[PDB]
Amino acid sequence: TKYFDYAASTPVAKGVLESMKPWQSDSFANPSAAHIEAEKALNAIKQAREIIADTLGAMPSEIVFTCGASESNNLAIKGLAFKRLEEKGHLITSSIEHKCVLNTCGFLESIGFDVTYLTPKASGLISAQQVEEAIRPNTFLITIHHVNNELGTVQPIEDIGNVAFEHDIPFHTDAAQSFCKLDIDVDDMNIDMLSLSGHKVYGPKGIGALYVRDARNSELVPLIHGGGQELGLRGGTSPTPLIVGLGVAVEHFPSEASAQQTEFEKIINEYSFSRNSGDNALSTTWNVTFENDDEVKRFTSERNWLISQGSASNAMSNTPSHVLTAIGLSEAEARRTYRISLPPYKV
Amino acid sequence: TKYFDYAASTPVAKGVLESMKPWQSDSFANPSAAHIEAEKALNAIKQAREIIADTLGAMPSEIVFTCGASESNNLAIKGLAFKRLEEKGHLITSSIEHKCVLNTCGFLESIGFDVTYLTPKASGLISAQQVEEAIRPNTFLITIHHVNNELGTVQPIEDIGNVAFEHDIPFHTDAAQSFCKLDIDVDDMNIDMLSLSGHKVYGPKGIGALYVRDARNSELVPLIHGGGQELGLRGGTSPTPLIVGLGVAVEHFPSEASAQQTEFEKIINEYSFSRNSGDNALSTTWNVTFENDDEVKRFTSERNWLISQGSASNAMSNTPSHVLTAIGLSEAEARRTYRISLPPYKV
Ligand SMILES: *Cc1c(COP(=O)(O)O)cnc(C)c1O
Ligand SMILES: *Cc1c(COP(=O)(O)O)cnc(C)c1O
């Protein structure tokens, strides 16, 4: 009434909710147990894992369940770093990553790791060439997001993956905003690890995944040590309802825009604005800078939309979006800038 | 039909399921957002946090949401350890902890930390005196579980907490099996950190918590770095349905045994057995060693109960429960030993 903040979270699809229901009280075993009720949960988990693997062009065993892209990003990064506590090393990322990536890299710096935060162009774009130029003898990970959560910018992951392949450096991508929206083939894009989030694709909150190439033989240091779940890479009892719901979300991901809401497209033009990353953004995120404070006032008074201006930490520090300032907007411009996002769909 | 494996997981209460429902598709904002829908989620999260705090005699801010006791155990342990990567140090735990604790401590050993795994008595008991005798100049954490998940053994956490207090060593307890069943006051027991799991108390899977004394000023290293959630201690978008459901579970935790099922008590005596930790175990977990293989055969053919014999890793290695062998049972005895567990309730 009206919600235009889909890049922040999405509503659980009816089919997803239904599919979760039998695993609440009807059949509720710990999937680790040795009896038939655990068997049933395990089979349902297998189906979801296969659906996710299929969509990424991966093998089922290469899908590690987590609780979301934040935990996934942490596992990808710390999983490699924590095998290097003595010799340390260098990581390449961007300055416009989600704050979870920025903050995990900040922590790594605090324990002696070196990190380059690549600065975007005004378009929001990170180039493969800049990745290539940042490479050092001790670079051990390149992490670059696929689609930017504030701007919608589609990054050149294939070209970046090519650079990482040419140097035999692991390539991770935060795909929380691209998973299901954009077709992703892990081999075609030379991806080693990929993060995704359930509640960004009409799935439930509290679930996501990390693709890990050759997970069975992976030397990644587990973030959560546990009882053997997820090939020993990710501990904690498998939350069968959340896993099942995630599979259903992926399977029934909307194929057409964004329904009727994404028109929208006939409203927004009654206003004067500049779209940030306008030639490089997905159709479902419109990060827009209105022309002046008077236009902002008109827009917000006429439209009672729930939208977004930047990260929570920026709100707390009373500063503009880190993303907006990285792309070169002034503080005054940032004040007039809003992310209006629409129901995700394929394409 | 019939499920006697409650120590492994429990069925979500009707009130818990209902309470989750409006946060799936009716109101589904990211609680980090700045608008009214996030406000509503945040308020509901606050209520659950307060319910949990109240039950532990803690302050609301001292409750850190996680996805379960595994993630909580990892945060408690690695959160302290990762501030010591250079000087390392010593940790005291038991050899009969849940495998998540054993495996995180094993990892710490692999990066240069020293760990003492205290061996139980035949009763399953760990003593405060043994903790005291294991203390070293560089001991920086004592972690001992409150109630054992295989045996039901109630450990002397107050006495152990007293020892830790007398040395100004942090005391953590894995309370996944004791939370709500046994009255826990964090100040009375001198607890610094405490792990709990939602699906052990008729809550949903994928949620738990870590009590952290003085969380606001805690120097714990976050396991999941994120956008600022949980006072910066635990990243990832707050899963409002799971958090709300956990509060409801705690609030309506059963007050009387375990209903009718826990009779049970009139069945079990038709069989010949010895109860492990029989003088020290909760009424709702019966870890029992039948007299001979013939008695086992009689019991299993007559009763189609879903029960448990030991951890998943022990099943995979084709070895007896680590818990059972630690308490001194032979492999043959372990073969005849089953954990039969009942609906949890207060007292
Ligand atoms: C939402 C998001 C995250 C965090 O994912 P959660 O599942 O909410 O923890 C990370 N990266 C990007 C790009 C996102 O949009
Ligand atoms: C279940 C359990 C755990 C693990 O908790 P999850 O929430 O299932 O990850 C840890 N310790 C004990 C004692 C348990 O019973």
Numbering used by the authors:
A (entry chain A), B (entry chain A): 2 to 348
Paper text:
Cysteine desulfurase, a pyridoxal phosphate (PLP)-dependent homodimer, strips sulfur from the l-cysteine substrate to generate l-alanine and a protein-bound persulfide intermediate on the active site cysteine residue. As a versatile sulfur donor, cysteine desulfurase activity is also essential to DNA phosphorothioate (PT) modification, in which the nonbridging oxygen atom in the DNA sugar-phosphate backbone is replaced by sulfur. In contrast to the typical dsDNA PT modification mediated by Dnd systems, Ssp systems confer single-stranded (ss), high-frequency DNA PT modification. SspA exhibits PLP-dependent cysteine desulfurase activity and is predicted to initiate the delivery of sulfur for ssDNA PT formation.
